[PDB]
Symmetry: D2
Subunit: 498 residues, 4 copies
């Protein structure tokens, strides 16, 4: 029997595990330490959650090591590993409403969005990677022959072993799923550290791995702090790979920690200040819709959000007028209400950061067209915000807000290389976008943009088959697509003489 926090909400009964998940069981942390997880809609405590300690990290890593080396997971056919992962996706689908409701409570995710995206894309992720298991293939290579003898050279793709996954709070289940599905499909075992502020869907997911028959110790989940739990994962001698999504500063520290312990492999999905270039020859009404989505999607808590919009001079004023008209129509409210389309920010400290961010924007001379303030209601709601007259030297032109803040600059009619230079003048390089009907401009701009993803006449169009990752200080390595698997596999070269 598992201990649950039970809650009647959104026409169902939530049964939320709140403990550490280690070696297939829910257990208290060392000293039965706990912390509170906070509902961003009203600021209330949802429940107490176990607070993992160093010795809990060591127990989780040991369980994952044992599951990998001696348990069933390291012994079953790749095809049968695939079947378990497909069954896990099915179990997630069976609990889709519950998962989306937990995400709404824990992260402020608008329920209809959480169903489609946070949860829906997570289900797709597991199904996609389940199909890879028995399709991961090595090679045979026509090497020079040691005549008069013969040689055969092949490669074997093998799992890396025990992995640690450390993730942020913006899409709790979805970030977990992106990384965990690739990690498990490759035959690894894993210890996951969800963001401290958003533990709940990760813990429910953990229970779902039991319903799906994932062998004990294959998945271990440790709610707790990055400075304690995430640090120990990066330091651990039995951990062989870290997959990390989060800020550039923490990413630097993770990579350093991997080096200093045992040169464990690392992948980094870091910040972004992604440019969206909107040309005068675009479909303007569609540009408004997609440009708004590029910023405001999931209350701006979106790693690939456009952190900068460059709008061609001749359409700039009309674009801004139309954005303001649409912003006024947005319904801000409880994420569980079906008419809501703008939920609360994830947690209080982040709301504070956004308020301060917009103060700095105003202070430095940018024009606040709308928003900029907390919404006067319970919880941590922030107004969808538009800045214009943004100049390249400005703080808000350089720093990632991670909030619903549209940051608009003009560029001269007929400029292309000049706007590209400005769009590329960042140490980030996660995503980017261009709206234009001109094929030649679209293709040229996509070539020249220094970003891991370039959207053309769309935005936020991720897909489980399409690799996602940054350039420059946005990191390296891919989540999603075949490419993601390479972070979780090692290649053994075997060379025979006969």
């Amino acid at each position: 029997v598992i201990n649950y926090v039970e809650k009647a909400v959104n026409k169902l009964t939530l049964q939320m595990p709140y403990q550490l998940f280690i070696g297939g069981e829910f257990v208290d942390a060392e000293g039965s330490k706990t912390y509170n997880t906070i509902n961003p809609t009203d600021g209330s405590v949802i429940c107490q959650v176990s607070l993992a300690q160093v010795s809990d990290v060591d127990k989780a890593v040991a369980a994952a090591k044992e599951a990998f080396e001696n348990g069933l997971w390291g012994k079953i056919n790749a095809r049968d590993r695939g079947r378990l992962l497909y069954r896990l996706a099915d179990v997630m689908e069976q609990h889709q409403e519950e998962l989306a409701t937990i995400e709404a409570l824990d992260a402020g995710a608008v329920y209809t969005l959480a169903l489609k995206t946070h949860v829906g894309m997570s289900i797709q992720t597991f199904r996609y990677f389940a199909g890879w298991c028995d399709k991961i293939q090595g090679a045979t290579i026509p090497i020079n022959q040691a005549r008069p003898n013969r040689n055969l050279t092949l490669t074997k793709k093998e799992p890396v072993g025990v992995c640690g996954i450390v993730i942020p709070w913006n899409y709790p289940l979805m970030m977990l799923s992106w990384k965990t599905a690739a990690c498990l499909a490759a035959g690894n075992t894993v210890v996951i550290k969800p963001a401290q502020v958003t533990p709940l869907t990760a813990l429910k997911f953990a229970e779902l791995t039991l319903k799906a028959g994932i062998p004990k110790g294959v998945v271990n989940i440790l709610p707790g702090s990055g400075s304690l739990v995430g640090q120990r994962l990066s330091d651990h001698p039995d951990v062989r790979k870290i997959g990390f999504t989060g800020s550039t500063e923490v990413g630097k520290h993770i990579m350093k920690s991997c080096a200093l312990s045992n040169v464990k492999k690392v992948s980094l999905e870091l910040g972004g200040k992604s440019p969206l270039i909107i040309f005068a020859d675009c479909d303007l009404n569609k540009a408004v819709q997609m440009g708004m989505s590029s910023v405001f999607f999931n209350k701006g808590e979106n790693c690939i959000a456009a952190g900068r919009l460059f709008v061609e001079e001749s359409i700039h004023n009309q674009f801004v007028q139309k954005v303001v008209e649409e912003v006024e129509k947005m319904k801000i409210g409880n994420p569980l209400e079906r008419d809501t389309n703008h939920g609360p920010q994830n947690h209080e400290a982040h709301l504070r950061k956004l308020v301060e961010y917009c103060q700095r924007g105003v202070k430095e001379g940018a024009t606040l067209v709308c928003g900029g303030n907390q919404v006067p209601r319970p919880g941590f709601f922030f107004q969808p915000t538009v800045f214009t007259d943004v100049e390249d030297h400005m703080y808000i032109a350089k720093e990632e807000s991670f909030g619903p803040i549209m940051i608009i600059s003009r560029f001269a009619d007929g400029d292309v290389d000049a706007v590209l230079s400005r769009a590329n003048a960042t140490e980030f390089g996660l995503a980017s976008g261009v709206f234009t009907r001109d094929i030649n401009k679209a293709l040229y701009v996509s070539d020249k943009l220094q970003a891991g993803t370039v959207f053309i006449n769309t935005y936020n169009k991720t897909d489980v088959a399409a690799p996602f990752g940054g350039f420059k200080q946005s990191g390296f390595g891919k989540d999603l697509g075949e490419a993601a698997l390479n972070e979780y596999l090692r290649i053994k070269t075997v060379t025979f003489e006969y």
Copy 2:
């Protein structure tokens, strides 16, 4: 007109550049600083070589950055980049006897071996990778369609940009060539730091890039210290990738330095303590030949050298007797003499380490069968060495010698998993081997060995098409083969809606 150190040796007149190579020209280091490079055959000074300073690193990086961003290398077709690399290989082949002679002088490489391997394989590497240029391909991906609209998702493989390559002294030209060929084939530009003790073939290679018509600034070479030049490369804000081969401890420091600066990509080819398991059902005389090669090849200065031989009890004594017979036939001498089998160690400090290494092996109780000492003659020669009765707890069972020291342990007749456990009981995982006529043992053993390469009934059989790289604390990423290209490329995802 280039300044050379001219030397008449080996029936040739060598013309050796000795300066820094920056932006297509040989130039003195800042303050005209120099150091001596030492011939290991007699301990003499070959010549003075420029000693690169931090400002020289900055100049090299600036030249590499300009060559990539604005120079011809970044504008030519992939096919034509390929042609230039194939021309470079032809120029290397035209200069092959000279390059091999320089390597004999600088590294103590036996001339006949240097022709075939140090230089021969370097030529193969550039020809192999030249072939990849116009065969590096991205993907088109069947993503979910945003109905009633359509989507197209493709990926583009792009160069990473400015790279730094840092290499060791055991195969100076060959290590340079492995990493440099892959780096340039992927469209990058490069700053290379050869090991301070072995700069000469790198600098002659620099001149050959001019003869081949490689655009100025594409290749820059900086003889000098790792703690100055290599460090600045790892720290530099304009360098986007480091490719490193060397020790595990320096690798840790490089990875840390990559993290703390700009999260530049890193790949690491580190040390090894590679096991070779010899079963009683092997071809014994072949096992003796290949077993000796596994240790003694290139005077043991060989990152994949077998650092432990486990020999089945019933053949152990006969194997050792046969090895001693063959060891006594090895001809030690000047690398330029055609009858030489065993050249001098690379430099004096390494010879000293080898002497100390074998003192400790004797102290801790292993049986010294032969060698263990500096050869009484000028230069830095070391006697091919055989230890037996080696136990798992011993220093020489754990530490990489990087010299011609065969380190033998027994295992009980029939004891497959037990010997595997002992072979895998290391934090290294670079290479490994198994000698057996039994197909079932060979396949099982190669599955169970925790190493990036497994040789079966052979050893030292590398090939430019076969990826080479370690597991665990031997690092990550591959040199050679298609897989090497992935360290030098980035993937851009481009997603259209229409």
Copy 3:
């Protein structure tokens, strides 16, 4: 509602469709023509089955064309096409006992074997290929640039369109499933012609496509004759690809018909006379078990069956003794008896061919060790048979029996190239095997065998991920594995200038 033949058998009430399946409906053939399908266990008529006419082929092709061009199948996401194929596999699994019972009745497949192989592998096939749908990818290619302009070249993998699949009677559901799964995974629509003698699992499968929600007209099934129905498929102007499995001579005729009509694509999986080479250094008792399986599996009605065993002189007589001992332990009987090892042959004409085949072998001078005739009992049972003293010029050394007839020749101790020559002296090239503990022999022999599949120390080890196809007059193209997809896809090159 669908009309069924109902049969209370094997603890089940079978519900067997017996009509043509066209455009998602079970329909009578033109003029309500029918034929009898015969139970090989007792020679009884199972039921009457619709006999497709030319006008029925035209209707099926028209339904497939409409389904491809205008129906849902041509519009849904690849991922969602995958979901439907997964669901079809689940539906087949839910009906697995019924399908295996139908196969026992219709083909004489031993029920326990039919569950595991005929049906179980069919389920694996659909699940495997379902995973490929959204992982079928094209390329982006670094072509030469039309300077001062730019070029982008990509490829798109597209379905071929309407396909015809023509199959034999030995594994009715499995052969259908192999080809159909790959065909549908690639986005095509299909008209299937099962062998006239074995229509029933194909028709039950058709019904299962309805339960799975496969759109109308995507799958059409036409029981009837090859010379009428199969011919019209190969001739049809709207069919773009034929996938064929059967005899070399029909294959030739099919390929000719494809040529003369509209040069539709063709793949051919034809006969075999597959050699199994058994060396004296093999594990003898395992060689007997696997050697017997290589011949007797599925009553020898197995395209990859070993049609000759070459057994090394020193073990030949012991091998034959052990085979005879084991043959005598085989239980012959009703496919539904749970201890049956050897079921009846598929139909009466095939039994008669096997009697004649063995008369011919004795006449021409081979030694009949055991078997060679019909088992006296109702139905069409043939004795497991062993021939020795088989010489290379003999009819039975050249002709495929497609029955449970082990055909043994000696080869000389210590010869390898000579036995290889004999094993390769056939115009077939489908499969082959080698039993030896010697790694060098195993690898050399696998290089030298002229056959699409080589088994090493096993036999009949097919796998849905491992491509299966012949060389020489065994045909071309693969079933199973990623390679199977290529027969069902076309490549469009799209080249932009911008």
Copy 4:
């Protein structure tokens, strides 16, 4: 010493072999039979060329068989095969002016174009495929394990063996090189049948294989008739693959012949009636230039030539006006004259077809704007032709001219699907094109076009890395790119149990 036809022309002394090339030597045909090859500039006999007989085909195939099975080509490293192919390309480059002059004489190729395309692209082809030799790789596949035992499955890519290549006359050396480069890169040996009317560059190429060190019997060349020499190649029991480029009707017969003999593999590059759709929003002057090229390149003797131009109503009249202006600037003359940009048609019988073609176009009611006739001068020159008011039912809207005949239809402004239907209403599907500045229209039209190549805002942009082949009755299989290799390789699956 080789017998040459010597010719002082184009400031060169041509040395042209004229005999069969068999087993590394130039030899007379059976009975010393010969035929005349005709210069299309003036109708004169260039020289007599050996006329291959059936016994000569058998000698060629025997030489290819021996070279493959026992000669050096079947024994060397893939890497060294690559080196030989690279060397071949270098030799071709050393003879480029001579090859281009021979092609001008034999095929009427304008010298400047023959240098850049006929010859230049052939050189690129051999270099490109030389790079593939040691990069052709098989797989290791994670199959289900026969527990308690283990399984390893790998694939080996092997050569198909002796190949026959049959090619047309429009780009004699280039069509030879496309197919031969891929064939040889895959490790095969070859018998080549050039078009009877254009034997000379093939025979010179044969001599260049000697200069390059290609082993005897690897390349064999048989000038002669399709109905005799080509037929015997397709029939031969020792030929295992035919690569064919030519008409759909000869393709059908070749494929039938492959079927009826030994089911040899076949690829077919057949005719085309390729549509070019020109939208009103295109760059009109560039559309004229590229539209001109699409039709008139290489005097229309171009398999991918646009066979119909569909021009949007609102720009149609202006397009035609601009085309006529450009047509009038074309200089018709001797291909060796530097100012010539329109050479003669290849041979007399082709000229006669073009004359009849345009008579029929006029008869059926199309508007003949200009040309349509043989130019009054010696040789076989044809006036660049423009037809307008072409309706879909007309012969010239359906049938491939293969001459310099622009065939223009209108479509209504704003129609997209309607013009696509018309463009796709053909049994051909080789190439196609769209000109438009609208990204959405370009991507949609490229999806919907039923052709193996789609050009966007360009035409005739082939590349050695970009696969080229037809759909429907334009055949199957690719020349060029990685995909071409698949026609010349077979896959062997090797499955171990251990």
